[PDB]
Amino acid sequence: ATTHVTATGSITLHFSTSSPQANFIVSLCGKKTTCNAECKPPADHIIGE
Amino acid sequence: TPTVCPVPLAHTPTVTKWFKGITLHLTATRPTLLTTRKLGLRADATAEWITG
Numbered sequence: 001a002t003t004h005v006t007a008t009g010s011i012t013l014h015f016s017t018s019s020p021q022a023n024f025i026v027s028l029c030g031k032k033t034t035c036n037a038e039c040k041p042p043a044d045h046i047i048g049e
Numbered sequence: 050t051p052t053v054c055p056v057p058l059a060h061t062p063t064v065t066k067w068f069k070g071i072t073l074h075l076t077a078t079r080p081t082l083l084t085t086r087k088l089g090l091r092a093d094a095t096a097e098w099i100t101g
Contacts, residue, residue, distance in 0.1 A: 046066050 075099050 003011055022037040059081055063074040075083065077099055084096035 044066065045068065046071055 077101060 020039040022039050025032050025034050060076045065072040080098050080100050086092050086094040
């Protein structure tokens with residue numbers, strides 16, 4: 001949900017998706033930035049989690 | 050009267066990894082009941098008795 005902020009710091013975030021196309025927009029504080037990329041299908045294909 | 054009784058926990062199975070499916074390895078020394086059901090609209094329930 002949130003994290004400690006900094007004057008010029010940087011962070012890493014986890015997420016999941018229903019498509020391999022990682023094209024979307026994401027909001028931090030009140031501002032937002034776009035994010036585009038390609039994700040690949042996994043090897044394992046059987047899990048109940 | 051009611052009470053508490055013990056029952057065996059049979060040899061649990063080895064699970065493979067199959068494309069849109071699974072293949073299992075059941076082991077038993079006596080007839081045992083097994084079953085499964087989907088988790089969506091269509092139950093697709095199934096049951097069986099396994100001897101060995």
